[PDB]
Design a protein around this nucleic acid. Structure first.
Lengths: 731, 746, 486
RNA sequence: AGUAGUAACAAGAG
RNA sequence: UAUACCUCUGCUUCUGC
RNA sequence: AAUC
């Protein structure tokens, strides 16, 4: 036992008066102040100082111990260390040769336990060695900035919880007051104490290695397709702004992680296939050859008893049963009867703020579940009607009631959101309203039960009631009861119909949140880009237009409406908001035909609008099409094309004859008409409108689209093309 | 002939695309030489030049010359105005409170609830701090400990309670103490016996002596800011002065900065404290909104903006008035707590560097004229540049050798709260219901205003209205440096937007060099900086694979550790060549031990020790990863994971702790100097703390808590350790009775 | 209250904005074209274009820095044993005898059989290193009393005009050779497909630079500054002779140990980082210093033999100079290989961007030009007031040269210039993009740019190169884009 | 001398 | 002065938010 | 199908 030596060293220490005064005057708080006391200033230029110091004889300091003494003073003429002591360490200063001498001829220590101590790192090597790689592919990639886990953890905990667990593993006597966490991770502590038993390595090191494999490292990174930590660690080799790399990590993968991916895979198959005709036939084509990391979407949907609306529609579309389940984080549901419809309304909450939430309308019946506890839920628009739950643990019963209360979107629930905790991220991006309401009321539940209200318990033979404390009681929660008793076909347009005639799932019901997937979202067929994002699709289309411009510009002056529709443009239309798709396609087809029929042709404008002409056009009551300044696309305020100017996604430099498409430079030189040199752009800016002369001050100010559309054919007007270029145009 | 021009690339590639080539970061940064007295005095003159038309008065507390520009006459010129009008600042805040409701009182709560939990040790992480006891910039950990021990002599034990709040109460009360006593160490010669022919030896034992100063002298020392020059600051021709404040003010700045930080997080038009990929997103999303928000058939212009004399114009009395309005709902003690730091800065006194070295080229002699002796010599002796400066310093100069800098914010320190005042300018949006609309972004001196309007002639009238607003806040826009254009591309804090924030590899480029921690850490850091730049700084696989070669190149020369097979001569290389010939598993050797570089794009995230572990020889890994080896010795939770990179942000890495994770010698210059006395003072604490850690093994990981005595804790710990070891059987009757006898004496 | 003050405030206070137009952009630096000023002198630490390496073919493996410089001189003994000083050029404040005696003292010391490379503290070496030239510290009370002691006026950088040698340095350093200098070590094997693309990209990117002049100078600078720092810490009190070494490999694959001169490091008791250690250089050269006299006022040049460059003979010279470095600048020498990355990244961005557009690896296309696509071309420079189209490989190296010149002439003048010239570069890019740029105080913006141009060569030449490029971008944009949609 | 460039180093201290 | 052709020192009187 |  060390005990005697510690006390007899304390006797040595207390003999010195200056040391004795320190121990008596310093508090246990103040330890942290006196530990950091030294002469050492902070090194401002460490790269310099190290490069300098390495050229000196004896730059390294050493620890005063028996092992330090086992290093000799010289070896084969080379001085390893000097008798001169270091100020801080009180040990013989040495050269970098001593390090090499130790490693070459020193004592051979105990390496038993090392692999288990530094486990966390060896699994990163395990995830590279066992892994396999796929194809490199060059082409544009949108990369979105989002907070993600940098390294995969053994068991995630808060900073205090992980620390308290660590304390129990390494320093049990000094742990102090036990918490709930003491009990919760008892298996992990028992495992880690048995694993880290035989090792000789210092506690402070061991506690650092636990902290890495318990405490979470979450920071913002640019990502695209893969969000999972086992991918995030490899991110640098997965994707660059202009390339893609397929990667498959080793070991094992999580079941939940496979669903989060699986949803977005379906969600995009549906989001693509809607605009192209025979939506089932395109969705089947893709879905038969989609891949999640290694597993195909067919096998994932078969094995996983989860998914959403989109997953069910594809599950049907391919074949086999459809699990109508909704996972609200902890809660896991299943639909008995009723069919809801989402609606966005401005809902005032308890603290005094109004935030947009997608409210569910109509009456419904669900089969709830929360760990061990079970039940059956009934609700109407913003009201919980019934909750017939079974008896289980207090925490499982309490949280299931909180999950069901939020879910129901009750007006009583929204009034008790007091304590300013809103849903808007630090980086200017809105969090999901409903999920943030769950996390608030799970911890702060006193408002929820108080603002709900109570009533009489059920007086049946099998039915009873429970109060706020989760015990059998007379005054139960208003609409809560504790009882003792525990094929389809698919359309062309992707709606699931019952044998009778009613439609259980609709294509219009799938959620429009095109979020980041968890695992590698691969498409084994060609033309993968068709399931991408706005800037990925926008570019790849315009790249394909310029690729075939020799054919497409010729065939636009021979066949009238043969090449207005093309296999590439179907995908382009899917990122146009379909409430406007026809209106843009009316304008596009009208302005392009104005350059065909008349002599005033513009190749830059042709290439810009040629992708907009797939959709069947939708004109006004007059006959004339809809006129536009910008053609707005799906998601992000920056995403649009401009008619009368250059846009963030599409602009032209006519000096160099070079086109900028989402950043990428594209040479249009040697692919232009010579008569475009001084040809005005007003003759391809409004449909059925051409330039007479230049701005006439008698005509007045520059007239707007609404004003221009409401002019008689043969009326002159003032149009500003791009800033500082006035033009005088007639209908 | 043919004249090659590098600027001719800008025909083929636009400026923003190849902006990396406009940054000369392979080159050497500018450093200062000699004193920074003239640099400081120039700041002192300039600061008072912008306020001299305000209210000049004499402080009855200190006896100093004070100037006050706040609520002063408005400027009739484009020179830097410090004359900020309180009402306009309050109205700007009121608007911000309307646009962001319930924020001020919530943030005031957040910071107040933090304050209670914040310990005294929090002051130890302030780098070099001015120690008022010895008048030197010392380490924050020491500068605190000197201040705690000196307070104890004047009956001030607030630090003993453990909370910051009583220590801050002791600081405001220490001004009231008439004579402030403190320690100063002096040497006594003592005979100690020896085998020294004459059987003894003289040893200069240090001893601490009690030393007093007056109330006013202590007030001035408490209000002192020590000034240097700014070394290694990029992209500037002439050098500038900086400052370091004392331990007293440090406590009160933390809370006022935390308060403003809480506000700056929630504000939509700020790049602080948000950084890295978070700020890259926040600005990118906030651009898209403020772009597409503009009227159709109108104009949206982005003013690429920047302020001038940012620190010199902003008065402390504005910052005082800011806190009061932010804490309006919070209690009277916290309102008074927050009001101190701006009250100190309002009455601050600036120390004047080293002095002025005077010479005679004929005689070949030199001599530093120190700050107090600046006027102990005819002004004709100084050069024309310095002669003008000293004449202008006269009314503000203090006879002790300082200058009272009542206006301005030397150093700055208040970043967040000064950024909030910027955001408050951006929050106005319009004046007189005219046909323009502005909103922007902010990071202290750097702003980026957008203006949406009908035509461009209107836009410029709105930017004038923005300019004339910011004058009333004390925020002076740089007419020279700032410039405007149509929205689409701009610059902000060296981040270049051109329909998207472009990659600028030259900014990070210096960080690719060898770090200067140790062989094990620098390897891990080196491969980490590669990995990271590939992701978010746009390094392709070829350049990344080159950087792997270029790091190892510099590593092998810096640490003198070339491949064992290579015949490059060296002291270490001689043993490295023997290691190569001895060891069988030579691919398992680390580069530091002249091993081969196994690194590549895919495995940059893994530590070299972990990669090669399987291919090492048992004897090699046994020595390399020996548990009781002397090289590492004693670690700390901050030391293993984290390391500095250049405020200086401390990044983290991963590497195994083995023989190459060593430490270097202390700077031995301290041996020659009179500060020898601190060397023993350290080793006295180190002896106590290392013994404390033997009793409490969790003291390394967890910060121990306790207002009780440090000895008391150790005694009780050792008491049970004995008793339980006896009863268990680990200790005998012989040893237990010895142990119980010793603990009785203590 | 804001509006209340805004009303009563004086109209004199305003931004006073003006729309920027191409004619408002006057040429930067009037003085640099003025012929009354002296031409900017060559003031680099070592030689670059003018250097001459004494090639000793070796085994390839490393040896002592004395032993290689010895055997390098053994091969070219004619120059080694040339004792007669045939002086050509002199630096105003130089000592012909001391300098030559120093060179002879070096040559013999490298030639000798002893292990040490130490040079004796002679009467000449003490002049050439500056022994005892530091001033004496005295008591403040004495200096206060002594009426002769005064604060001296500060030394300011002089104003130089444009010099052609910088242009020619750029022209020459950019150009290819048959020799490779770089010491690029091994890496791990390529398993992933991105690593194979990265490897095949390096075979074009790295070996384009490696085979140029600028690559050899860069490597020479580094390897000198690596040993120069090493001697400076270890051998503080000792005056030591260090050779200017580089190992070079040709197209055949044969290691030629080079020697571009010899140098002598002074006494190096370097406390602060900025403390100077004076280093005396002696450098071989084919260039006649009487060609460009204004290039070499800092140098003192002898003539020491002759060498046949191929058939016709070239006279060999010895460029001597008292120079100096410091701990910071020596370190930055060791981190000067990073000049590769800053230029290689920039052009890998083009390869990556062009690979996205075409959908395959557009490396081999950009340099050589494959079946589908022609080679990528860049505006490289001028030919009697006209444009010139250089290839990818050339455009890569012109950027790489600039990154080396950012080091070689890296200082307060370059940093302050580059930053302020950027502001004007961005304003030009607005006029190029037709984004209607406005400015508030252009004269004062110019003032910040123009004050940084004094006596730094790369600053002075880049002020000219700016004004040349400006002239081309002014006539391109103001003609074509002025009248189009009218 | 030279390095440097608004002021230093070209050794300091006992 | 003397020891001192010795001895000690190379970011440790300045380098912040 | 998001939080920390």
């Amino acid at each position: 036992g060390m005990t005697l030596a510690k006390i007899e060293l304390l006797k040595q220490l207390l003999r010195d008066n200056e040391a004795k005064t320190v121990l008596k005057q310093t508090t246990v708080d103040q330890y942290n102040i006196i530990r950091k006391f030294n002469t050492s200033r902070i090194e401002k230029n460490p790269s310099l100082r190290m490069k300098w110091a390495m050229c000196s004889n004896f730059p390294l300091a050493l620890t005063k111990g028996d092992m330090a003494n086992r290093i000799p003073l010289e070896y084969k003429g080379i001085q390893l260390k000097t008798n001169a002591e270091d100020i801080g360490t009180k040990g013989q200063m040495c050269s970098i040769a001593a390090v090499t001498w130790w490693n070459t001829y020193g004592p051979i220590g105990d390496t038993e336990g090392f692999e288990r101590v530094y486990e966390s790192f060896f699994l990163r090597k395990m995830r590279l060695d066992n892994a396999t790689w796929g194809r490199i592919t060059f082409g544009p990639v949108e990369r979105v900035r989002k907070r993600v886990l940098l390294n995969p953890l053994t068991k995630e905990m808060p900073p205090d919880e992980a620390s308290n667990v660590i304390m129990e593993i390494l320093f049990p006597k000094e742990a102090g007051i036990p918490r709930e966490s003491t009990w919760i991770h008892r298996e992990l502590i028992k495992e880690k104490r048995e694993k880290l038993k035989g090792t000789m390595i210092t506690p402070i090191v061991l506690a650092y290695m636990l902290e890495r494999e318990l405490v979470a490292r979450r920071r913002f990174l640019p990502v695209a397709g893969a969000t999972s930590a086992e991918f995030i660690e490899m991110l640098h080799c997965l994707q660059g702004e202009n390339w893609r790399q397929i990667y498959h990590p080793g070991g094992n993968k999580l079941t939940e992680s496979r669903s989060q991916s699986m949803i977005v895979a379906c969600r995009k198959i549906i989001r693509r296939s809607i605009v192209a005709s025979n939506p089932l036939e395109l969705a089947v084509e893709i879905a038969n050859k989609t891949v999640i990391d290694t597993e195909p979407l067919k096998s994932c949907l078969a094995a996983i008893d989860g998914g959403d609306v989109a997953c069910d529609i594809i599950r049907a579309a391919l074949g086999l049963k459809i699990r109508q389940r909704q996972r609200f984080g902890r809660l896991e549901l299943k639909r008995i009867s009723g069919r809801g419809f989402k609606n966005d309304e401005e809902i005032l909450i308890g603290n005094g703020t109004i935030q947009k939430i997608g409210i569910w309308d109509g009456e419904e019946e669900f089969h709830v579940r929360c760990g061990e506890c079970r039940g059956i839920l009934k609700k109407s628009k913003m009201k919980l009607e019934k909750l017939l739950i079974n008896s289980a643990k207090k925490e499982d019963m309490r949280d299931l009631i909180i999950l069901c209360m939020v879910f129901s979107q009750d007006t009583r629930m929204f009034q008790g959101v007091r304590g300013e905790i809103n849903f808007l991220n630090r980086a200017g991006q809105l969090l999901s309203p409903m999920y943030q309401l769950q996390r608030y009321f799970l911890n702060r539940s006193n408002d929820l039960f108080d603002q709900w209200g109570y009533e009489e318990s059920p007086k049946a033979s099998e039915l009873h009631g429970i109060n706020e404390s989760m015990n059998a009681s007379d005054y139960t929660l208003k609409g809560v009861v504790v009882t003792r008793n525990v094929k389809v076909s698919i359309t062309k347009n992707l709606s699931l119909i019952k044998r009778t005639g009613e439609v259980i799932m609709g294509a219009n019901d799938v959620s429009e949140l095109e979020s980041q997937a968890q695992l590698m979202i691969t498409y084994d067929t060609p033309k993968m880009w068709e399931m991408g994002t706005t800037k990925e699709l926008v570019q790849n289309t315009y790249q394909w237009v310029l690729k075939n411009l020799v054919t497409l510009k010729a065939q636009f002056l021979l066949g009238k409406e043969d090449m207005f529709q093309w296999d590439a443009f179907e995908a382009f239309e899917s990122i146009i908001p379909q409430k406007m798709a026809g209106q843009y396609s009316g304008f596009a087809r009208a302005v392009l035909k104005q350059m065909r029929d008349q002599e005033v042709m513009k190749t830059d404008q042709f290439i810009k609008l040629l992708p907009f002409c797939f959709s069947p056009p939708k004109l006004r009551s007059n006959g004339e099409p809809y006129q536009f300044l910008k053609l707005v696309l799906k998601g992000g305020g920056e995403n649009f094309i401009e008619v009368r100017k250059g846009s963030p996604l599409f602009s032209y430099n006519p000096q160099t004859e070079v086109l900028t498409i989402c950043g990428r430079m594209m040479s249009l030189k040697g692919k232009i008409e010579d008569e475009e040199r001084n040809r005005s752009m007003g003759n391809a800016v409004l449909a059925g409108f051409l330039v007479s002369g230049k701005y006439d001050p008698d005509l007045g100010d520059f007239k707007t689209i609404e004003e221009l559309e409401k002019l008689k054919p043969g009326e002159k007007a003032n149009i500003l093309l791009y800033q500082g270029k006035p033009v005088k145009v007639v209908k | 002939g043919m004249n090659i021009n590098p600027y001719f690339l800008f025909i083929d590639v636009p400026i923003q695309a190849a902006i990396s080539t406009t940054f000369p970061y392979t080159g050497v940064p500018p450093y200062s030489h000699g004193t920074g007295t003239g640099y400081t005095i120039d700041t002192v003159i300039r600061t008072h030049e912008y306020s001299n038309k305000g209210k000049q008065y004499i402080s009855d507390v200190t006896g100093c010359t004070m100037v006050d520009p706040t609520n002063g006459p408005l400027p009739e010129d484009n020179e830097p105005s410090a004359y900020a009008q309180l009402d306009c600042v309050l109205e700007a805040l009121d608007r911000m409170d309307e646009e962001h409701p319930g924020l001020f009182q919530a943030a005031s709560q957040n910071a107040m609830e933090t304050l209670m939990v914040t310990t005294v040790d929090k002051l130890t992480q302030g780098r070099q701090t001015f120690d008022w006891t010895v008048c030197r910039n010392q380490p924050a950990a020491t500068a605190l400990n000197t201040t705690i021990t000196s307070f104890r002599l004047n009956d001030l034990n607030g630090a003993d309670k453990g909370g910051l709040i009583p220590f801050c109460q002791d600081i405001i009360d220490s001004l009231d103490r008439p004579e402030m006593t403190f320690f100063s160490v002096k040497n006594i010669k003592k005979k100690l016996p020896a085998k020294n022919r004459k059987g003894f030896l003289i040893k200069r034992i240090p001893m601490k002596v009690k030393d007093k100063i007056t109330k006013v002298e202590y007030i001035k020392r408490a209000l002192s800011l020590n000034t240097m020059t700014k070394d290694a600051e990029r992209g500037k021709l002439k050098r500038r002065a900086i400052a370091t404040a004392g331990i007293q003010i440090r406590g009160f700045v933390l809370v006022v900065e935390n308060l403003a930080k809480n506000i700056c997080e929630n504000l939509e038009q700020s790049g602080l404290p948000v950084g890295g990929n978070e700020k890259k997103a926040k600005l990118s999303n906030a651009v898209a909104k403020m772009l597409s928000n503009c009227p159709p058939g109108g104009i949206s212009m982005t003013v690429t903006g920047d302020n001038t004399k940012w620190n010199e114009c902003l008065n402390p009395r504005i910052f005082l008035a800011m806190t009061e309005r932010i804490t309006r709902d919070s209690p009277i003690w916290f309102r008074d707590f927050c009001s101190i730091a701006p009250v100190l800065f309002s009455n601050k006194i600036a120390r004047l560097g080293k002095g002025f070295m005077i010479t005679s080229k004929t005689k070949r002699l030199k001599a530093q004229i120190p700050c107090p002796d600046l006027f102990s010599i005819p002004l004709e002796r100084y050069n024309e540049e310095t002669r003008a400066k000293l004449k202008k310093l006269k009314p503000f100069f203090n006879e002790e050798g300082t200058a009272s800098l009542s206006p301005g914010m030397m150093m700055g320190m208040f970043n967040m709260l000064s950024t909030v005042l910027g955001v408050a300018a951006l929050g106005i949006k319009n004046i007189g219901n005219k046909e323009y609309l502005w909103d922007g972004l902010q990071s202290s001196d750097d702003f980026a205003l957008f203006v949406n309007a009908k035509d461009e002639e209107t836009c410029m009238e709105g930017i004038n209205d923005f300019y004339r607003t910011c004058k009333l806040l004390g925020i002076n826009m740089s007419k020279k440096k700032s410039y405007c254009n149509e929205t689409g591309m701009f610059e902000f804090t060296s981040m270049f937007y051109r329909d998207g924030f472009v990659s600028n590899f030259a900014m990070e480029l210096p960080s690719f060099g060898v770090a200067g921690v140790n062989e094990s850490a620098d390897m891990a850091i080196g491969m980490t900086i590669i990995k990271n730049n590939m992701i978010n700084n746009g390094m392709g696989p070829a350049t990344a694979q080159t950087a792997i070669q270029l790091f190892i190149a510099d590593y092998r020369y810096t640490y003198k550790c070339h491949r064992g097979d290579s015949k490059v001569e060296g002291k270490r290389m001689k043993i490295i060549k023997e290691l190569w010939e001895n060891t069988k598993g030579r691919d398992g050797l680390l580069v530091a031990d002249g091993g081969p570089n196994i690194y590549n794009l895919r495995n940059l995230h893994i530590p070299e020790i972990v990669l090669k572990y399987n291919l090492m020889d048992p004897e090699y890994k046994g020595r390399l990863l020996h548990p009781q080896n002397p090289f590492v010795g004693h670690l700390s939770i901050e030391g293993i994971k984290e390391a500095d990179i250049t405020p200086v942000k401390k990044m983290d890495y991963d590497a195994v702790s083995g023989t190459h994770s060593w430490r270097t010698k202390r700077n031995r210059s301290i041996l020659n100097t009179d500060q020898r006395n601190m060397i023993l003072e350290e080793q006295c604490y180190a002896k106590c703390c290392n013994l404390f850690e033997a009793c409490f093994n969790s003291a390394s990981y967890r910060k121990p808590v306790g207002q009780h005595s440090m000895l008391e804790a150790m005694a009780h710990r050792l008491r049970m350790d004995a008793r339980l070891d006896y009863e268990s059987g680990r200790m005998s009757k012989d040893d237990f009775e010895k142990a119980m006898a010793h603990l009785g004496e203590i | 209250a804001i509006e209340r003050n805004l009303a009563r405030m004086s109209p004199l206070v305003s931004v006073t904005p003006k729309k920027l137009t191409w004619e408002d952009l006057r040429p930067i630096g009037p003085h640099i074209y003025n012929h009354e000023l002296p031409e900017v002198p060559y003031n680099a630490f070592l030689l670059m274009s003018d250097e001459l390496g004494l090639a000793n073919m070796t085994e390839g493996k490393s040896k002592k820095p004395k032993t290689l410089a010895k055997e390098c001189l053994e091969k070219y003994s004619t120059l080694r044993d040339q004792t007669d000083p045939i002086l050509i050029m002199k630096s105003e404040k130089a000592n012909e005898n001391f300098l030559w005696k120093l060179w002879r003292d070096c040559v013999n010391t490298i030639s000798n059989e002893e292990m040490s490379n130490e040079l004796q503290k002679t009467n000449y070496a003490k002049w050439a290193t500056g022994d005892g030239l530091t001033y004496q510290k005295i008591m403040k009370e004495v200096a206060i009393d002594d009426e002769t002691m005064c604060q001296e006026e500060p030394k300011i950088p002089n104003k130089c005009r444009v010099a052609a040698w910088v242009q020619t340095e750029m022209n020459l350093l950019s150009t290819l050779t048959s020799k490779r200098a770089l010491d690029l070590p091994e890496i791990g094997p390529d398993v992933a497909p991105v690593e194979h693309v990265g490897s095949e990209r390096r075979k074009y990117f790295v070996n384009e630079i490696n085979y140029c002049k600028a690559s050899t100078v860069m490597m020479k600078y580094v390897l000198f500054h690596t040993s120069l720092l090493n001697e400076s810490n270890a051998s503080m009190g000792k005056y030591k002779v260090i050779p200017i070494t580089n190992r070079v490999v040709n197209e055949k694959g044969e290691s030629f140990d080079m020697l571009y001169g010899l140098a002598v490091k002074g006494q190096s008791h370097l406390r602060g980082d900025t403390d100077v250690v004076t280093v005396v250089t002696f450098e071989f050269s084919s260039t006649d210093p009487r060609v460009d006299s204004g290039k070499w006022p800092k140098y003192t040049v002898f003539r020491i033999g002759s060498l046949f460059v191929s058939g016709r003979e070239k006279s060999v010279y010895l460029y001597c100079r008292v120079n100096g470095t410091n701990k910071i600048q020596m370190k930055w020498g060791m981190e000067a290989r990073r000049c590769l990355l800053q230029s290689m990244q920039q052009m890998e961005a083009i390869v990556e961007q062009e690979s996205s557009i075409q959908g395959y690896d557009m490396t081999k296309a950009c340099f050589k030009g494959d079946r589908v696509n022609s080679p990528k071309t860049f505006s490289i420079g001028t030919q009697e007031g006209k444009l010139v189209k250089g290839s990818f490989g050339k455009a890569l190296r012109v950027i790489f040269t600039k990154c080396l010149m950012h080091y070689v002439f890296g200082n307060a003048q370059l940093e302050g210039f580059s930053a302020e010239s950027r502001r004007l570069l961005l304003l030009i890019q607005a006029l190029k993009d037709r984004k209607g740029p406005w400015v508030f105080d252009l004269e004062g913006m110019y003032s910040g740019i123009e004050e940084c141009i004094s006596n730094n060569p790369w600053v002075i030449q880049s002020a000219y190169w700016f004004n040349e490029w400006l002239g081309f971008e002014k006539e391109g944009s103001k003609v074509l884009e002025s009248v189009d949609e009218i």
